Structures are given as C-alpha cells and as structure tokens.
Amino acid sequence: WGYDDKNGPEQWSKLYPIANGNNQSPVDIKTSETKHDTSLKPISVSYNPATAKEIINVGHSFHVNFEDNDNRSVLKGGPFSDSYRLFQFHFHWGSTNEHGSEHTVDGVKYSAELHVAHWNSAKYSSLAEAASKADGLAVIGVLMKVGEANPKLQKVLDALQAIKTKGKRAPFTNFDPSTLLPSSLDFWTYPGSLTHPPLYESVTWIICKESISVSSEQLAQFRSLLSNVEGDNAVPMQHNNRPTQPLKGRTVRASF
C-alpha cells in the first residue's frame, strides 16, 4: 500500500475492508455540530526526555520512537480514566502548502499535522496487544499552519540528514515532545482509527483547537526525504495524508 494512485487511500479497501468502517479517521470537524461535555477534564502530559530513542525512515514517512517499558512518559486527563504511555510521534504533509493535514476544521485544510501516539498500559501489557482494542490507543493531533519558522522543530529537522533513504535509522535522544504542543490544550475528541493500514478502529483522538506554525522551508525539508533505498534513483516523499472519512453518526465532543 501507499499514497500513490495505484495503491493509494481510495484503493485501500481492497486489501483492508475496514477502510469503509464506521469509526475511520481522519474526519472533518464541523464546529456547529460538536457537543460540549462538562465531563471532560483538562489534558495532562508528562514526558521524560530520557525516553527518546530512535528516528527511522519508513518509506512513506519518518517516525521518532520512545522507550515504553515503564510510565516515565504518560498522557492523562481529557476523556481518559487510565494513563496512556507515549511510544511515538510523526507528521503528515502534502505536495504543496495548500494541503497536508489529515483532519480538517470546518472544511479548512492545513499544511501539515503532528501526531503523538500512546497506548493503554493500565489495561494492556504491550503496544501489540493494545493496537487492536477499542480503548487501546490515544493520539494527539495538532494542525500545522504555514507561517513563521518553528524553532521547536529544530532538533527533529536537523536529524533528517542522517536518515535520508528508506530503512535508515539513527539514535534520537534527550527530547521531550510536549515542547511541540500548542500553548493552549483545549481539544475535540472522537472515537476513530489508525490513518494508514491496518486502519484499526482503536484510537481515541485528541485534536487541539490551537495550531502551531511551520515555515514553507521547513515543510520542504519533510518533502525532501526519500522513499527509495540507498543507491536507487531518488524519489522524494511528496505527500502522506489520508482524505477525511464519513462521520457515520459519531459525535465529536469539545472541551471548550
């Protein structure tokens, strides 16, 4: 599978039938249809920079992984009763500044999106077990609006030159991803899924109301990563965002 015309999102249903499920992500958040909930508590994140471990080029994107053997880095509050353990963060982008984000707000598309993923360590023993459970994963999504350069993305961007081609990986340590989140943590939440195969409907999404910035040049750095293996003709990672999917009766709740 991929994001190309032949094996792209529109064709994923052939190999992964759940792509046409009733809890698929991303979605378009229509603010006039969101339901306020006083039951929702503020989001609380506490990450230990010592848990940062490695950065990897996976062909269609790049991931920054964290050690998840204990609860040194966790997410709590919001619609959760259990604490979720941080395990990875990555981004999605488009071919030009005009698109790139996965989620949209009132039909508006942004240039990129940051995803910070966690798994339920209170109920499960590992990521593999939790990934298929309805309450197994929690992902924070932050919309990235093109504008001024974001200095907080510096360490991440400077690391790409060491993992330019598919399969390359390198140590990525002493980093706290909470520094990438917006100043305000007001959010929207809804029951969804992984945005790429296997597309499991096991994700409770936390979408931030406030966006963070990114410059046109920083976006160019994401797009310059290569999807081919070392030695082959270079093929830039042009885009990796999935189109929004039908809400199918789900309700998006707002913490504000």
Ligand SMILES: [Zn+2]
């Ligand atoms: Zn993602």
